[PDB]
Short mmCIF file of N, CA, C and O in Angstrom, two decimals:
data_model
loop_
_atom_site.label_atom_id
_atom_site.label_comp_id
_atom_site.label_asym_id
_atom_site.label_seq_id
_atom_site.Cartn_x
_atom_site.Cartn_y
_atom_site.Cartn_z
N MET C 28 10.32 -7.54 59.79
CA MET C 28 9.38 -7.15 58.74
C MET C 28 8.10 -6.58 59.35
O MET C 28 7.67 -6.99 60.42
N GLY C 29 7.50 -5.62 58.65
CA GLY C 29 6.28 -5.01 59.13
C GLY C 29 5.74 -3.95 58.18
O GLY C 29 4.59 -4.02 57.76
N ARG C 30 6.58 -2.98 57.84
CA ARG C 30 6.19 -1.91 56.93
C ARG C 30 7.03 -1.93 55.66
O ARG C 30 6.64 -1.38 54.63
N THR C 31 8.19 -2.58 55.74
CA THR C 31 9.09 -2.67 54.59
C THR C 31 8.60 -3.71 53.59
O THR C 31 8.81 -3.58 52.39
N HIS C 32 7.94 -4.75 54.10
CA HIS C 32 7.41 -5.82 53.25
C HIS C 32 6.35 -5.28 52.30
O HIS C 32 5.96 -5.95 51.35
N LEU C 33 5.87 -4.07 52.58
CA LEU C 33 4.85 -3.44 51.75
C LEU C 33 5.41 -3.05 50.39
O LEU C 33 4.70 -3.08 49.38
N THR C 34 6.69 -2.69 50.36
CA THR C 34 7.35 -2.30 49.12
C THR C 34 7.32 -3.43 48.10
O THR C 34 6.87 -3.25 46.97
N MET C 35 7.81 -4.60 48.51
CA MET C 35 7.84 -5.76 47.63
C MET C 35 6.42 -6.19 47.25
O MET C 35 6.12 -6.40 46.08
N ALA C 36 5.56 -6.32 48.25
CA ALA C 36 4.18 -6.73 48.03
C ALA C 36 3.47 -5.76 47.08
O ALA C 36 2.72 -6.18 46.20
N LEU C 37 3.72 -4.47 47.28
CA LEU C 37 3.10 -3.44 46.44
C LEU C 37 3.51 -3.61 44.98
O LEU C 37 2.68 -3.51 44.08
N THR C 38 4.79 -3.88 44.76
CA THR C 38 5.31 -4.07 43.41
C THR C 38 4.63 -5.24 42.72
O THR C 38 4.24 -5.15 41.55
N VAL C 39 4.49 -6.35 43.44
CA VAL C 39 3.85 -7.54 42.89
C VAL C 39 2.42 -7.25 42.46
O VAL C 39 2.02 -7.57 41.34
N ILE C 40 1.65 -6.64 43.36
CA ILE C 40 0.26 -6.31 43.07
C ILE C 40 0.16 -5.39 41.86
O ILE C 40 -0.61 -5.64 40.93
N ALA C 41 0.93 -4.31 41.88
CA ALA C 41 0.93 -3.34 40.79
C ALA C 41 1.35 -4.00 39.48
O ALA C 41 0.75 -3.77 38.43
N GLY C 42 2.39 -4.83 39.54
CA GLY C 42 2.88 -5.51 38.36
C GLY C 42 1.79 -6.29 37.65
O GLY C 42 1.59 -6.15 36.44
N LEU C 43 1.08 -7.13 38.41
CA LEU C 43 0.01 -7.94 37.85
C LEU C 43 -1.07 -7.06 37.23
O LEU C 43 -1.47 -7.26 36.08
N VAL C 44 -1.55 -6.09 38.00
CA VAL C 44 -2.59 -5.18 37.53
C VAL C 44 -2.19 -4.54 36.20
O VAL C 44 -2.95 -4.57 35.23
N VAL C 45 -1.00 -3.96 36.16
CA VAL C 45 -0.50 -3.31 34.95
C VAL C 45 -0.52 -4.27 33.77
O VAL C 45 -0.80 -3.88 32.64
N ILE C 46 -0.21 -5.54 34.04
CA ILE C 46 -0.19 -6.56 33.00
C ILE C 46 -1.59 -6.82 32.45
O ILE C 46 -1.82 -6.77 31.25
N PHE C 47 -2.53 -7.09 33.36
CA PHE C 47 -3.91 -7.36 32.97
C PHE C 47 -4.50 -6.18 32.21
O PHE C 47 -5.22 -6.35 31.22
N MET C 48 -4.19 -4.97 32.68
CA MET C 48 -4.69 -3.76 32.04
C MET C 48 -4.01 -3.52 30.70
O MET C 48 -4.67 -3.39 29.67
N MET C 49 -2.68 -3.48 30.71
CA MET C 49 -1.91 -3.27 29.49
C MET C 49 -2.24 -4.33 28.45
O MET C 49 -2.58 -4.01 27.31
N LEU C 50 -2.13 -5.59 28.85
CA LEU C 50 -2.42 -6.70 27.94
C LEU C 50 -3.82 -6.57 27.35
O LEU C 50 -3.99 -6.66 26.13
N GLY C 51 -4.81 -6.36 28.21
CA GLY C 51 -6.17 -6.23 27.75
C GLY C 51 -6.35 -5.05 26.81
O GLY C 51 -6.90 -5.19 25.72
N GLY C 52 -5.90 -3.87 27.24
CA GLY C 52 -6.02 -2.68 26.42
C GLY C 52 -5.20 -2.76 25.15
O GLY C 52 -5.59 -2.22 24.12
N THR C 53 -4.05 -3.44 25.23
CA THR C 53 -3.17 -3.59 24.08
C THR C 53 -3.75 -4.57 23.07
O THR C 53 -3.87 -4.26 21.88
N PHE C 54 -4.11 -5.76 23.54
CA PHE C 54 -4.68 -6.78 22.68
C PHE C 54 -5.92 -6.26 21.95
O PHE C 54 -6.00 -6.31 20.73
N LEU C 55 -6.88 -5.77 22.72
CA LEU C 55 -8.12 -5.24 22.15
C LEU C 55 -7.82 -4.12 21.16
O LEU C 55 -8.36 -4.10 20.05
N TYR C 56 -6.97 -3.19 21.57
CA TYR C 56 -6.61 -2.06 20.72
C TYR C 56 -5.96 -2.55 19.42
O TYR C 56 -6.34 -2.12 18.33
N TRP C 57 -4.98 -3.44 19.55
CA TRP C 57 -4.28 -3.98 18.39
C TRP C 57 -5.26 -4.63 17.42
O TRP C 57 -5.27 -4.32 16.23
N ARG C 58 -6.09 -5.53 17.94
CA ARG C 58 -7.08 -6.22 17.11
C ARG C 58 -7.91 -5.23 16.32
O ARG C 58 -8.02 -5.33 15.09
N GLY C 59 -8.51 -4.26 17.01
CA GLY C 59 -9.33 -3.27 16.35
C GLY C 59 -8.54 -2.44 15.36
O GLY C 59 -9.02 -2.15 14.26
N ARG C 60 -7.33 -2.04 15.74
CA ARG C 60 -6.48 -1.24 14.87
C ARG C 60 -6.34 -1.88 13.49
O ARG C 60 -6.61 -1.25 12.47
N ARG C 61 -5.93 -3.15 13.47
CA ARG C 61 -5.76 -3.87 12.22
C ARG C 61 -7.10 -4.11 11.54
O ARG C 61 -7.18 -4.26 10.32
N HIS C 62 -8.17 -4.14 12.34
CA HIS C 62 -9.51 -4.36 11.82
C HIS C 62 -9.86 -3.31 10.77
O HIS C 62 -10.38 -3.64 9.69
N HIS C 63 -9.58 -2.05 11.08
CA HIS C 63 -9.86 -0.95 10.16
C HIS C 63 -8.57 -0.28 9.70
O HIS C 63 -7.72 0.07 10.51
N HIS C 64 -8.44 -0.11 8.39
CA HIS C 64 -7.26 0.52 7.82
C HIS C 64 -7.39 2.04 7.83
O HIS C 64 -6.39 2.76 7.93
N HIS C 65 -8.62 2.53 7.74
CA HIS C 65 -8.88 3.96 7.74
C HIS C 65 -8.69 4.55 9.13
O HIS C 65 -8.62 3.82 10.12
N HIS C 66 -8.62 5.87 9.20
CA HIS C 66 -8.43 6.56 10.48
C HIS C 66 -9.66 6.39 11.37
O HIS C 66 -10.76 6.12 10.88
N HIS C 67 -9.47 6.56 12.67
CA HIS C 67 -10.57 6.43 13.63
C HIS C 67 -11.59 7.54 13.43
O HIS C 67 -11.23 8.72 13.44
N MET B 68 2.64 -14.13 65.83
CA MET B 68 1.19 -14.08 66.03
C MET B 68 0.60 -12.81 65.42
O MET B 68 0.90 -11.70 65.86
N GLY B 69 -0.24 -12.99 64.41
CA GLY B 69 -0.87 -11.86 63.75
C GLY B 69 -0.91 -12.01 62.24
O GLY B 69 0.08 -11.74 61.56
N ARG B 70 -2.05 -12.45 61.73
CA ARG B 70 -2.21 -12.65 60.29
C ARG B 70 -3.68 -12.53 59.89
O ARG B 70 -4.42 -13.50 59.93
N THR B 71 -4.08 -11.32 59.51
CA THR B 71 -5.46 -11.07 59.10
C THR B 71 -5.52 -10.36 57.76
O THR B 71 -6.23 -10.79 56.84
N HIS B 72 -4.77 -9.27 57.64
CA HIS B 72 -4.73 -8.49 56.40
C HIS B 72 -4.15 -9.32 55.26
O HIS B 72 -4.24 -8.94 54.09
N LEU B 73 -3.55 -10.46 55.60
CA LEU B 73 -2.96 -11.34 54.61
C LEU B 73 -4.03 -12.02 53.77
O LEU B 73 -3.83 -12.30 52.59
N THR B 74 -5.18 -12.29 54.39
CA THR B 74 -6.29 -12.94 53.70
C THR B 74 -6.76 -12.11 52.51
O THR B 74 -6.79 -12.60 51.38
N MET B 75 -7.12 -10.86 52.77
CA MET B 75 -7.58 -9.96 51.72
C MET B 75 -6.48 -9.73 50.69
O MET B 75 -6.72 -9.84 49.48
N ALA B 76 -5.29 -9.40 51.16
CA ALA B 76 -4.16 -9.14 50.28
C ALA B 76 -3.86 -10.36 49.40
O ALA B 76 -3.58 -10.22 48.21
N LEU B 77 -3.93 -11.54 50.00
CA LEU B 77 -3.67 -12.78 49.27
C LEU B 77 -4.67 -12.96 48.13
O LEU B 77 -4.30 -13.34 47.02
N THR B 78 -5.94 -12.68 48.41
CA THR B 78 -6.99 -12.81 47.42
C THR B 78 -6.74 -11.89 46.22
O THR B 78 -6.88 -12.30 45.07
N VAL B 79 -6.36 -10.65 46.51
CA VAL B 79 -6.08 -9.68 45.46
C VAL B 79 -4.96 -10.15 44.55
O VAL B 79 -5.09 -10.15 43.33
N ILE B 80 -3.85 -10.56 45.16
CA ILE B 80 -2.70 -11.04 44.40
C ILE B 80 -3.07 -12.25 43.54
O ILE B 80 -2.79 -12.28 42.34
N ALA B 81 -3.70 -13.24 44.16
CA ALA B 81 -4.12 -14.44 43.45
C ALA B 81 -5.10 -14.11 42.33
O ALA B 81 -4.99 -14.64 41.23
N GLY B 82 -6.05 -13.23 42.62
CA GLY B 82 -7.03 -12.84 41.63
C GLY B 82 -6.40 -12.33 40.35
O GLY B 82 -6.72 -12.79 39.26
N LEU B 83 -5.49 -11.37 40.49
CA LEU B 83 -4.80 -10.79 39.34
C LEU B 83 -4.04 -11.86 38.57
O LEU B 83 -4.18 -11.99 37.35
N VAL B 84 -3.22 -12.63 39.28
CA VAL B 84 -2.44 -13.69 38.67
C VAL B 84 -3.32 -14.63 37.85
O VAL B 84 -3.05 -14.89 36.68
N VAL B 85 -4.38 -15.13 38.48
CA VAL B 85 -5.30 -16.04 37.81
C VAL B 85 -5.85 -15.42 36.53
O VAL B 85 -6.06 -16.11 35.53
N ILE B 86 -6.08 -14.11 36.56
CA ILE B 86 -6.60 -13.39 35.40
C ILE B 86 -5.58 -13.37 34.27
O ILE B 86 -5.89 -13.75 33.14
N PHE B 87 -4.37 -12.92 34.58
CA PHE B 87 -3.31 -12.84 33.59
C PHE B 87 -3.03 -14.22 32.98
O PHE B 87 -2.79 -14.34 31.78
N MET B 88 -3.05 -15.24 33.83
CA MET B 88 -2.81 -16.61 33.38
C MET B 88 -3.98 -17.14 32.57
O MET B 88 -3.82 -17.58 31.43
N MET B 89 -5.17 -17.09 33.16
CA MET B 89 -6.38 -17.57 32.49
C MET B 89 -6.59 -16.83 31.17
O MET B 89 -6.76 -17.46 30.12
N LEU B 90 -6.59 -15.51 31.23
CA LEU B 90 -6.79 -14.69 30.04
C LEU B 90 -5.78 -15.06 28.96
O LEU B 90 -6.16 -15.31 27.81
N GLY B 91 -4.51 -15.10 29.33
CA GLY B 91 -3.47 -15.44 28.37
C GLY B 91 -3.64 -16.83 27.80
O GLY B 91 -3.63 -17.02 26.58
N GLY B 92 -3.81 -17.82 28.68
CA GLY B 92 -3.98 -19.19 28.23
C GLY B 92 -5.27 -19.39 27.46
O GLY B 92 -5.34 -20.21 26.55
N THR B 93 -6.30 -18.64 27.84
CA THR B 93 -7.60 -18.74 27.18
C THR B 93 -7.57 -18.09 25.80
O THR B 93 -7.96 -18.71 24.81
N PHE B 94 -7.11 -16.85 25.75
CA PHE B 94 -7.03 -16.12 24.49
C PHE B 94 -6.19 -16.89 23.47
O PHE B 94 -6.66 -17.18 22.36
N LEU B 95 -4.96 -17.21 23.84
CA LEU B 95 -4.06 -17.95 22.96
C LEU B 95 -4.69 -19.27 22.52
O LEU B 95 -4.68 -19.62 21.34
N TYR B 96 -5.24 -20.00 23.49
CA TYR B 96 -5.86 -21.29 23.21
C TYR B 96 -7.02 -21.13 22.23
O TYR B 96 -7.12 -21.85 21.24
N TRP B 97 -7.90 -20.17 22.51
CA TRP B 97 -9.05 -19.91 21.66
C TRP B 97 -8.61 -19.60 20.23
O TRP B 97 -9.09 -20.21 19.28
N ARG B 98 -7.70 -18.64 20.10
CA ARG B 98 -7.20 -18.24 18.79
C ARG B 98 -6.71 -19.45 18.00
O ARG B 98 -7.13 -19.68 16.87
N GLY B 99 -5.82 -20.23 18.61
CA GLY B 99 -5.28 -21.41 17.96
C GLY B 99 -6.36 -22.42 17.63
O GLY B 99 -6.36 -23.01 16.55
N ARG B 100 -7.28 -22.63 18.56
CA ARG B 100 -8.37 -23.58 18.37
C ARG B 100 -9.13 -23.28 17.08
O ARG B 100 -9.18 -24.11 16.17
N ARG B 101 -9.73 -22.09 17.02
CA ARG B 101 -10.49 -21.68 15.84
C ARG B 101 -9.79 -20.54 15.11
O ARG B 101 -10.30 -19.42 15.05
N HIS B 102 -8.62 -20.83 14.55
CA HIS B 102 -7.85 -19.83 13.82
C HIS B 102 -8.67 -19.24 12.69
O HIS B 102 -8.46 -18.09 12.29
N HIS B 103 -9.61 -20.02 12.17
CA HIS B 103 -10.47 -19.57 11.08
C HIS B 103 -11.13 -18.23 11.42
O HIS B 103 -11.58 -18.02 12.54
N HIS B 104 -11.18 -17.34 10.44
CA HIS B 104 -11.78 -16.02 10.63
C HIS B 104 -13.19 -16.15 11.18
O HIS B 104 -13.79 -17.23 11.15
N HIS B 105 -13.73 -15.04 11.69
CA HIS B 105 -15.08 -15.03 12.25
C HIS B 105 -16.10 -14.67 11.18
O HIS B 105 -15.77 -14.08 10.16
N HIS B 106 -17.36 -15.03 11.43
CA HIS B 106 -18.44 -14.75 10.49
C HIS B 106 -19.58 -14.01 11.18
O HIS B 106 -20.75 -14.35 10.99
N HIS B 107 -19.24 -13.01 11.99
CA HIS B 107 -20.24 -12.23 12.71
C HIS B 107 -19.62 -10.96 13.29
O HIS B 107 -20.29 -9.95 13.44
#
């Protein structure tokens, strides 16, 4: 192992980030969306 | 013999995880705790 372990490690890091970002942007967006029935 | 970049990398991974977990457990917990609508 040396440079190949970067593939797995990279996926883990990216996975978490995408979750925190997606979840945050999704939750906040969803909440606001339902908040107002009219168009933005 | 050789482990330095693991420190920084470890922090990043742990940081994200803690966020996804804390945020999720906090948000869900908060919502359930005070399900009552907001007044502000």
